[PDB]
Amino acid sequence: TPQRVREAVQEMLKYGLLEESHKPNLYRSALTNIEVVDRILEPLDLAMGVDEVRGLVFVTVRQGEVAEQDDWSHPLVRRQRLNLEQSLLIAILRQHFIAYEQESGTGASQALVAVDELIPQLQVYLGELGSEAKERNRIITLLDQLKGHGLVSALDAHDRVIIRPIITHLANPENLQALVVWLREQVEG
Amino acid sequence: TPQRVREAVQEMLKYGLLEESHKPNLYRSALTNIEVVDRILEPLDLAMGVDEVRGLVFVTVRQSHPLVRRQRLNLEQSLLIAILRQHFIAYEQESSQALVAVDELIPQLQVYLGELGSEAKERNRIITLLDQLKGHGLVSALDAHDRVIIRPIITHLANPENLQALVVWLREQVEG
């Protein structure tokens, strides 16, 4: 087994994703050995997703013959499930990412959003608290909860957050449709 | 690949140990599929060791390993490891699970690290050391009657190199 393949597998499993912009060598090594990586990860019940357009190599749960394995009962899964408040925040961040991606061209750029811009839109649904401090603390708590899932990063000195492109694979149209149907069933009865 | 085999391999790699008293089904599945587990763990530079006397299935680095981290312990942990190992040896020479009282280890630790002069200090030090060893998965949870359970892994604590280092350090501490 090539050393580069093993190192790429180790790094990808440790971090959950590989980005060419930061790890071009690992990205190329894992991208050129899809069959080998699939063979190695098959006993672990894991699968690899690649987005060459956005340059990302992520790891998801391998699909078995079981109709509903729930994708959360895997022994190696450590993270908690997702509730409705975080789901709405993720949808809003996905809309922000769409807006960023529409008016974008060649060149290296990042999606940064200020908290104050996000506050009123989430106040529209959740509501408004008596003091701005309460709402700000709630928003900071939610942003920390989402950062625990690797969707965003820590705040900078100018009260801004960075939306990772991984949300694009989190809010893919299939998952969006499934969640929309589930929420519609939740509302209807 | 059988689902039971994959589950046993995943659990064994996740925990590093398998006991029939806790998971008899997984223990039987792994013990009846030695070659399959060895084939699965071969690309990972890992091997399965079986101790049928105590039903202990452990993972050993077959051959300093990318997936295994080396960390050293201090004397305040080394001497307690020696005390627990000798207690388990005495218990197994008596022929179940080795039950060691909290009050038992207070004098064995005081005669080596001195007397702190307070019962609270002794209890806190014993609890902290026991929790540190719990972080390594060497003993079980504390019982209601200030007792702990010693796992069979103490028999497979380490190679004779670490046992010789342990006895040398224990003799040095006894010298003071």
Binding site: G16, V59 | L13
Partner: peptide, 25 residues
């Protein structure tokens, strides 16, 4: 306006799952 509804888990597969911190050794 209900905390129970807001904390009701949804259905979204985990994407970009990292390692479980440590192999517990």
């Amino acid at each position: 306006q209900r905390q129970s509804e807001r904390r009701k888990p949804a259905c979204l597969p985990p994407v970009g799952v990292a390692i479980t911190g440590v192999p517990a050794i």
